[PDB]
């Protein structure tokens, strides 16, 4: 019942929060967030992310309006197909996010874009 | 009070629209010297917001003023700058847009002024990027679509006319921004308007007005 990937933004986090309060963050198998997703945090309680660690690629963890998806690492063999499949596990909604495969210690911007576009959710993508 | 200095300037702008260019620099300089609190900045925002949403023909002037203050005020409190506080205030009425569009006549009238202020804000509000500084507020581009959707979803005459006004004001800019990004929001809009004409119980004159938008936009 919600729009198919509208995507993009230039405005800051608090500014983009006008549209929605829902955030999509990217984590590794240890439950540790990637740098871009770590920056997106503004004093939220992240204890819940260690409570169920470790995670399998594709595991989704949500508490309140914060969503976290376990993504494959390219520097450890991860492929674009694996990345897209992990994102398809994300419940369809409107999210403020970053590029998943960003960037060094991961996928290219085009590969991260492809995976977000392959997803059915609508995104508001902050740059890193 | 500091609040009454601001309201007097807002009232002065209403009475003398041509005074903006020669008096705006002095307004910013005075505010830079006296606004030093998070609460004082919050108050400045509230006063401008109220004038823009409650006073007729202040939609354009309000938006023009907001853009200028956003990049000419030096204060940067830890709760957010002028721009951030302004945008947060808009989020408040925006959150209930679905409810406001189905409210009583007075609630709807208030909503219409909010919508048209956001339309002027979209056009006037400039945002500087990392490489491309010449950008509009993208969140407003999205917000305006949702506000239009909200208006067409409650197809009462006043809501519909508000949407017509908003599309006359911003339609060309939105049309170009959507076409450049390969989005079909304009086509969606046209179809939503067509569905209103087909199904809605509103006045024939409003429907005729809507049909004429179909000729212009496509």
Residue numbers in the entry:
A (entry chain A): 389 to 516
B (entry chain B): 78 to 295
Paper text:
SARS‐CoV‐2 and SARS‐CoV share an otherwise non‐conserved part of non‐structural protein 3 (Nsp3), therefore named as “SARS‐unique domain” (SUD). Paip1 acts as a positive translation stimulator to regulate the key translation factor PABP in the host translation system. The three‐dimensional structure of the N‐terminal domain of SARS‐CoV SUD (“macrodomain II”, Mac2) in complex with the middle domain of Paip1, determined by X‐ray crystallography and small‐angle X‐ray scattering, provides insights into the structural determinants of the complex formation. In addition to receptor usage, the potential of a zoonotic virus to establish itself in a new host will depend on its ability to cope with the innate immune system of this host and possibly with its capability to use the host's protein synthesis machinery for its own benefit. Our study provides new insight on the latter aspect for SARS‐CoV by demonstrating that the SUD‐N (Mac2) domain interacts with the host cell translation apparatus via Paip1 and increases viral translation.
After trying many optimization methods and testing over 240 crystals at the synchrotron, we managed to collect a 3.5‐Å dataset. The structure of the Mac2:Paip1M complex was finally determined by first using the SAD data to position Mac2 in the asymmetric unit and then employing molecular replacement to locate Paip1M. One Mac2:Paip1M heterodimer exists per asymmetric unit. Mac2 adopts the typical α/β/α macrodomain fold. The main structural difference between the two Mac2 structures is located within the N‐terminal segment Lys389–Thr408. However, the β‐strand is replaced by a loop in the Mac2:Paip1M complex. In the Mac2:Paip1M complex, this region is a long loop, while it forms a β‐hairpin in free Paip1M. About 840 Å2 of the surface of Mac2 and 779 Å2 of the surface of Paip1M are buried upon complex formation, according to the PDBePISA server (complex formation significance score: 0.86 on a scale from 0 to 1, Krissinel & Henrick, 2007). The predominant interaction regions between Mac2 and Paip1M are confined to the N‐terminal loop Ile394–Leu407 of Mac2 and to α5 (Arg160–Arg168), the central loop (Ile204–Thr212), and the N‐terminal half of α7 (Ala214–Glu223) of Paip1M. Taken together, the N‐terminal Lys389–Thr404 region of Mac2 is indispensable for the interaction with Paip1M.
